[PDB]
């Protein structure tokens, strides 16, 4: 769903 380069933390 989210952008792969978005915040994963």
């Amino acid at each position, epitope marked *: *769903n*989210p952008d*792969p*380069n*978005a*915040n*994963p*933390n």
Partner: antibody
Amino acid sequence: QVQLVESGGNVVQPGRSLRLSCTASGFTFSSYGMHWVRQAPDKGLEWVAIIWYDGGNKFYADSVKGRFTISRDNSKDTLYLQMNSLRAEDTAVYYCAKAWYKIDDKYSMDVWGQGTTVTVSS
Amino acid sequence: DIQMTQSPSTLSASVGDRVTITCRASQSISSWLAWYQQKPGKAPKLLIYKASSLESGVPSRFSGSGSGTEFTLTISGLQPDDFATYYCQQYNSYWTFGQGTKVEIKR
């Protein structure tokens, strides 16, 4: 200081499986996403997979889709990479890297582990 | 995908020189570019993030510059600890690295 220790690298025959590990210390593991990156002279540095802090969202490089499965156990501070039906071109040093927290729109990785060696051969 | 290409592949310089490593992108990545350093047998080390921001604990002799498709990593006053390989990495769409640039001792 952030500490990432990879484990599980070994000689594996083509078509077989192998699971790597990455135990972390020196920070709160459950708070960060994690990457897998492999290095070999034929591929240079090649990104493998990323997983969110909670283990939900996962992404993979195209060449490993359907064969590699990334997961994490936050109660153990361990990151895993399940590699199935391994091929000769999967031979490399595999790094786990912590996602960074430079607050912006796009994110990457800052601290890498020491790596673990996977040799796919019969 | 977005392919990175560094230049040159191997650079020869001496201590105290100003060296320049160039990274080129296949499409516009704005300023989402990171620079890493790697020494033989060791892991990569983050040097520059967002094209020009210096990672904490990194000497001031490292400077980053660039935008869009062309980027440059400059090391003013080269020191013995700097002889290593330098990679660029875009993080605009997934993560892809350049082939690497080895800085060697000139003689």
